[PDB]
Design a protein around this ligand. Sequence first.
Ligand SMILES: CCCCCCCCCCCCCCCCCC(=O)OC[C@H](COP(=O)(O)OCCN)OC(=O)CCCCCCCCCCCCC
Ligand code: HEM
Ligand code: HEM
Ligand code: HEM
Ligand code: HEM
Ligand SMILES: COc1c(O)c(C)c(C/C=C(/C)CC/C=C(\C)CC/C=C(/C)CC/C=C(/C)CC/C=C(\C)CCC=C(C)C)c(O)c1OC
Ligand SMILES: CCCCCCCCCCCCCCC(=O)OCCCOP(=O)(O)OC[C@@H](O)COP(=O)(O)OCCCOC(C)=O
Ligand SMILES: CCCCCCCCCCCCCCC(=O)O[C@H](COC(=O)CCCCCCCCCCCC)COP(=O)(O)O
Ligand SMILES: CCCCCCCCCCCCCCCCCC(=O)O[C@H](COC(=O)CCCCCC)COP(=O)(O)OCCN
Ligand SMILES: COC(=O)N(OC)c1ccccc1COc1ccn(-c2ccc(Cl)cc2)n1
Ligand SMILES: COC(=O)N(OC)c1ccccc1COc1ccn(-c2ccc(Cl)cc2)n1
Lengths: 54, 93, 93, 61, 248, 50, 385, 110, 126, 62
Amino acid sequence: SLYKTFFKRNAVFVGTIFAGAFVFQTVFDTAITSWYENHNKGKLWKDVKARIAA
Amino acid sequence: GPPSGKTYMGWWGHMGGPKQKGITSYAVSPYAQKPLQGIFHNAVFNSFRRFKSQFLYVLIPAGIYWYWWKNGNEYNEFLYSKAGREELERVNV
Amino acid sequence: GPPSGKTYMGWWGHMGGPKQKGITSYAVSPYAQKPLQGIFHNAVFNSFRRFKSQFLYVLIPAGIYWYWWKNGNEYNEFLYSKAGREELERVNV
Amino acid sequence: MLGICTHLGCVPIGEAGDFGGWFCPCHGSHYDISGRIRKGPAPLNLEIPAYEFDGDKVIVG
Amino acid sequence: MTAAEHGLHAPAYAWSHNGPFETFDHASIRRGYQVYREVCAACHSLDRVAWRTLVGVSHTNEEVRNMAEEFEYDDEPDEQGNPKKRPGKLSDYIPGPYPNEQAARAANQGALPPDLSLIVKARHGGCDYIFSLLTGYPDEPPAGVALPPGSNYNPYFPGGSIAMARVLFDDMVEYEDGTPATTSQMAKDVTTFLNWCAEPEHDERKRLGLKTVIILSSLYLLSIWVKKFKWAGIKTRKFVFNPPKPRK
Amino acid sequence: WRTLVGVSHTNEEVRNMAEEFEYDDEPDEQGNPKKRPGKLSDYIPGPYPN
Amino acid sequence: MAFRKSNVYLSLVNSYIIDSPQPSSINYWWNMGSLLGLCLVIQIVTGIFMAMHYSSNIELAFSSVEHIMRDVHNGYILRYLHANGASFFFMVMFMHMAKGLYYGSYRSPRVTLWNVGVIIFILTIATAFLGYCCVYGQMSHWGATVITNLFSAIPFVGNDIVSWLWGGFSVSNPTIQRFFALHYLVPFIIAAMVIMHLMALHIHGSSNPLGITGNLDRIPMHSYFIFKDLVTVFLFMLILALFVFYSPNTLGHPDNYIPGNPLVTPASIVPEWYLLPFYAILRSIPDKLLGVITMFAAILVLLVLPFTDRSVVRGNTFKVLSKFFFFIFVFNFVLLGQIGACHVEVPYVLMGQIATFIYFAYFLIIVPVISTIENVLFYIGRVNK
Amino acid sequence: WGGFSVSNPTIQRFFALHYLVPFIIAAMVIMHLMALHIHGSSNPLGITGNLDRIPMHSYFIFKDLVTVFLFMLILALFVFYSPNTLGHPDNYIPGNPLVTPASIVPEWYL
Amino acid sequence: PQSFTSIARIGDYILKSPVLSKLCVPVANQFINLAGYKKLGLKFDDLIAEENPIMQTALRRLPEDESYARAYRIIRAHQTELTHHLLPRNEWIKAQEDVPYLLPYILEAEAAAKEKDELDNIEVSK
Amino acid sequence: KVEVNLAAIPLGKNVVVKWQGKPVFIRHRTPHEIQEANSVDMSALKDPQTDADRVKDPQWLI
Ligand SMILES: CCCCCCCCCCCCCCCCCC(=O)OC[C@H](COP(=O)(O)OCCN)OC(=O)CCCCCCCCCCCCC
Ligand code: HEM
Ligand code: HEM
Ligand code: HEM
Ligand code: HEM
Ligand SMILES: COc1c(O)c(C)c(C/C=C(/C)CC/C=C(\C)CC/C=C(/C)CC/C=C(/C)CC/C=C(\C)CCC=C(C)C)c(O)c1OC
Ligand SMILES: CCCCCCCCCCCCCCC(=O)OCCCOP(=O)(O)OC[C@@H](O)COP(=O)(O)OCCCOC(C)=O
Ligand SMILES: CCCCCCCCCCCCCCC(=O)O[C@H](COC(=O)CCCCCCCCCCCC)COP(=O)(O)O
Ligand SMILES: CCCCCCCCCCCCCCCCCC(=O)O[C@H](COC(=O)CCCCCC)COP(=O)(O)OCCN
Ligand SMILES: COC(=O)N(OC)c1ccccc1COc1ccn(-c2ccc(Cl)cc2)n1
Ligand SMILES: COC(=O)N(OC)c1ccccc1COc1ccn(-c2ccc(Cl)cc2)n1
């Protein structure tokens, strides 16, 4: 069943606690950064630098 | 080490209360019952019941001290206006 | 609190040794005797007796390590003289 | 004259006043030339240093 | 105190960086530095801002290297101990007009103009007070107030009299991007540049706080769940009493 | 200078030795530098500037 | 037996953290002591990482703190956490003390535990004062001037104490370098008093909200009250993060971003919010010597409460009159802070005088008289003839 | 280092850590004493001491004063009459990265 | 704290007096109802603090049957309070049951401690 | 990077800079002068290395 592979064990429990911790951080970072940079579109330096094109 | 001066509390087995006889306790496992079961019938029943009891002991004091801060702040602003310069030179002396 | 894992030493009354029977102890007060009574017949009898026992265990090692420091310090000063410049260029390579 | 208003620590401005002496914008702390409060609510006129005279000397101490 | 000795209350303007998810407008910073260089820098210093911190914020690397080289800095002495000079580099700090406090007061009738690196954080009101000050000089002072000679009236300064005179007027600056350089427009860009000078971590801080508040908010809800599960035995436990016989 | 008084020289002697050297004063009312003679709280000067 | 019970060092962890008997009925007001222990860890750790970049010289001090903000990686996080962490430490302590006053925890058999706590409070006001002076802005210079000049009124000996505290004739460089070295020290003395505080709790354990014995129903600490304490740890770390990252200068004064100058006085010299009620008590006494005595007496009148409560019941849960006057005293303590942030002007002069009296009359005149009245009412309501 | 060489950031961090570690040593000295109280002290013969015990006060307190005053005496003789014999003269030269000493030598105990 | 000997001296004076009893008793009854210890199933003598020697003595001298019931009322009240509920209104202590069951054991232990203490500091005549 | 540029330090000049707080030696060259350097064979010395490995464009030395 499910109990004996995910929960019962106490090495791929504490194992998969840190496994997801390393993976959660990177996707969580990329997602928040993309939402912030899009909510403030037109005020950033990258957009201005492209807009002062002379 | 040596034993020190004893307490009004012990430990498991000799906690230091009176002897009990004739009391029975029953309980059920948490795995066998459903959590988050009634927490409305809690915030609307019990919180409102607990509020209704202990709210006249907190709000009658709060009303006396806030009224006091008011009448002082109102009077100060009058003293330093131009319509209250005569009173200022009376009370500041 | 609870009792922890016990020791090889107790306290006064239950120190944890064997039961004693048949031993008698006698003593006299210090106020009733004279202090600084024999401390020669001490530094000349006992210190010299204690020295004479435990001095060949300390001095034979000390003599081996000091001789070693000597022959090295003597040889180094020869290497860096002008009479020992040929040996220096042999051993330093 | 030392400028430690005891209850302020304020700094009277030279080149101003009513008598060619002193004004501070502090409370209306007017002083006189010699330095005696005159029209400001401060309680006392302030400490003159224990400076002496000895010739090419004024030992402001 | 009266209201004059306190000062007039600054209003609440709708700044584009106010909000928990907002950033600075970087085109207003770039325009604001131009107002500083051509109006403010004659009598105000900016001692706590280095040249390098402008790269990637308002100007390009090649632009900032050319602005710094227009100033001379003290070099270390030569082979015989005589002093030298050199042009500016990126690790240098923005120079001020005066060499000491005495020369600054001499050029401003005894008064000392302050450094502006931290003026937004060191005044009650913040950006609303800086803007309202520059745009608050009336035509005439109100009838009755006697100003000293050499002082100017505007009601946002405590007391009512300030040593600065009005310095902003329409169309004194020609902007590179074609913005109309009205009085209010330049005042807004100046204050935005100055807030960046005080808080150069504003944009990074507000997004690390979005990460931290989301993580801690879910841990707080998970902790309430886990508590109520592990406490369910104690909350529903029941007791019964049957009086024994007092034989004992 | 002050540490020589009571050790090798008299107070009046040390005040005259220090006054034979010039020290940087604080700037004047217009910000230009000034000079002054030495006093007892000053340190013994060296020959070279760097 | 188990290793956690036999080992010399883990036996102490087990007896204090794991198997400790706790009353079944204690509520979330009993969780503040845990938070004050996390607070002390936050401040000590954040402070040691800043001390690596700080310079205590009076000509270098203000600019070192601005250098932590601009040039140090994540240095703005360390300072704002640290500065706002002290405001949170004081708020949890006032709530911890107000609880014990409500539930009678000062009474015998726990008089010794209340007294070690009063010491921690004094040493904590001293610590925070010394640290604010190390910024050396304009509230830093003139706040140390006002407080250190108070000791010049002690008879015949005062002007020797101020010059030994200053290291000179004014607040100057020797003052700022000695205040930083003492400010690092006192946190380690507070930690040693926190261990002695816990030893005195282990003897009789904790009380409970009903004021009766708890030896008939006890629950162990682990996995009922450990997980009940996580609930309030994460709420504390959430609200603190909201101040550090979104509003990091609302619990301060703007004048302390102006560098310290002895030649220009501010228009309003005001302490932080958590020393304002004691600052109003001082200003209320016209004489200088009596003022500094009355201010320190405001902290040590708490030691008189175990002998002025004349009741046979512990706590206020079943006491009607003693509830009303507990909340009078709380809101009188909030008015003293407000008046401490005002100008010395009519009518804020007399208001702070009447409110300084009510602070002292509570401990010395009100509690003895209502406790005796309540005892006699319990008697004649049951025993009536 | 905090940089690319021994520099200013190195010297300011080494002083703040140098104040700290003495308070960690003190906490380890308390844990050291707790472990002695369990079994007590040994003796020069290497056998049990539970058959003949003396209390600490006024036999071993006054025996310890003897060695406290000898320690203070010899220390005072170094502080007041020979205060730089257990050091190196080069540490009265200020630190210079551009001139190496002819002999880099630690204190005698390292 | 105040002695039960002093509490009883003041109370008895109030109760024997007609005018004072008609003026102070109704205040005392509604002080009892507003307190709310009966709603948790407790009598007043359950509330008296027990960490002192006079009160430890009184609890030993108490009969076994009255002592077993006291332990149950105290356990039931702790459980009622951690759930943040009140007991059913048919389980509330009534006025006729709220009797001072422990007061005589307290007054007896107090009177003996005063007699012993006077005898240890006596001034003798000659 | 305390990076000097090219026309600074002349003929008879071997200036010691504090680049990265390092005692760094910079010298000036003349094109005849790396035969100068490898005037020798290597068995006289420890580790066989060449001008082309010394410094990239060796006519300005660091
Ligand atoms: C030397 C210096 C010493 C001076 C220190 C002075 C201390 C003042 C600090 C104020 C701290 C805030 C007040 C904390 C109050 C704790 C009271 C408490 O422990 O809870 C009491 C009560 C519990 O209710 P019961 O246990 O009686 O149960 C009901 C019937 N079953 O539960 C309650 O009713 C609590 C209701 C909440 C009251 C809110 C008022 C808070 C006032 C705001 C202060 C901050 C404003 C800036
Ligand atoms: C856009 C242009 C300028 C800005 C934004 C600016 C900024 C400021 C600010 C924010 C203050 C605040 C002091 C306070 O009220 O507490 C101030 C004061 C002052 N400014 Fe400016 N400045 C500008 C141009 C100038 C110029 C060109 C001069 C001189 C010709 C000048 C002279 C002064 C003086 C003397 C004060 C001191 C006021 C006093 O203490 O009474 N300013 N300035
Ligand atoms: C109970 C623990 C402590 C408390 C309550 C406390 C309190 C304070 C306060 C209120 C300030 C002024 C905040 C401001 O900048 O506005 C401060 C500053 C400071 N404190 Fe502490 N402190 C504690 C522990 C420590 C320790 C142990 C250290 C050093 C290891 C330390 C180092 C500093 C430093 C360097 C500053 C400089 C100003 C700053 O960085 O904000 N603190 N402290
Ligand atoms: C750094 C400061 C402090 C720390 C870390 C601390 C820690 C603790 C802890 C962990 C408890 C356990 C029970 C509980 O949380 O209520 C406690 C209880 C207690 N504390 Fe503190 N405390 C501090 C300051 C104080 C102060 C300032 C006072 C009073 C002036 C005080 C008086 C008490 C009392 C009376 C109790 C027992 C309450 C009861 O059992 O009903 N403590 N403390
Ligand atoms: C540096 C601070 C230290 C302090 C304050 C300290 C303190 C003490 C004291 C008071 C005793 C009991 C009296 C005695 O046997 O002399 C003791 C015993 C002892 N210490 Fe330490 N000590 C320190 C360091 C050390 C070190 C570095 C070691 C070993 C690496 C050590 C190992 C021991 C042992 C094995 C004993 C028991 C000896 C016996 O009972 O025969 N201690 N210590
Ligand atoms: C009712 O019963 C209770 C109870 O309810 C609770 C909650 C607790 C737990 C609560 C406590 C308050 C105890 C916690 C202990 C403290 C608060 C004392 C803390 C002491 C210190 C000395 C803290 C210092 C912390 C450090 C990390 C210092 C070291 C510094 C470092 C590592 C940073 C610098 C390092 C580098 C490399 C730069 C009890 O102990 C307890 O008793 C039975
Ligand atoms: C008459 C002649 C005298 C002359 C000589 C002068 C010398 C005077 C001073 C003598 C030295 C002091 C005595 C030594 C002493 O008391 O401590 C040393 C013994 C070890 O200390 P401890 O108290 O057992 O530890 C202290 C412990 O017993 C108490 O543990 P606790 O901290 O309460 O647990 C909390 C931990 C919880 O864990 C966490 C934090 O999660
Ligand atoms: C000390 C005074 C109480 C204050 C609150 C204590 C907070 C710190 C301790 C955290 C609880 C850990 C106990 C878990 C356990 O041992 O039981 C473990 C649970 O461990 C697990 O596998 C699940 C992961 C644990 C979740 C961790 C939550 C937060 C961790 C710290 C957050 C930062 C402060 C089960 O074994 P047990 O039932 O025998 O105790
Ligand atoms: C109040 C202030 C000071 C007191 C602090 C008490 C609380 C401190 C918590 C300490 C955490 C646990 C430390 C290690 C626990 C295991 C010790 C052990 O196994 O004992 C030894 C190993 O010896 C060591 O190496 C000790 C290293 C100490 C580490 C210093 C942090 C073996 O275990 P032992 O046989 O002695 O236990 C007896 C039970 N049968
Ligand atoms: C956090 O720092 C400040 O708020 N400080 O100090 C720079 C400040 C700033 C401005 C004005 C006044 C103060 C001081 O206000 C008080 C009021 C009481 N104490 C005190 C101090 C030490 C001791 Cl043992 C006991 C009582 N200090
Ligand atoms: C008292 O100070 C000196 O003598 N220092 O240090 C400035 C010195 C001075 C000159 C030359 C060498 C040294 C260092 O010599 C040593 C030898 C071993 N360690 C060491 C250090 C840390 C740790 Cl964890 C473990 C071992 N250090």
